[PDB]
Amino acid sequence: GAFVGQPEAVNPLGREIQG
Numbered sequence: 001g002a003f004v005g006q007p008e009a010v011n012p013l014g015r016e017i018q019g
Contacts, residue, residue: 008014
């Protein structure tokens with residue numbers, strides 16, 4: 001859920017980096 005990173009759920013809808 002941000003401008004860039006990795007899929008939040010699984011399909012790339014949201015892009016955050018997270019722990």
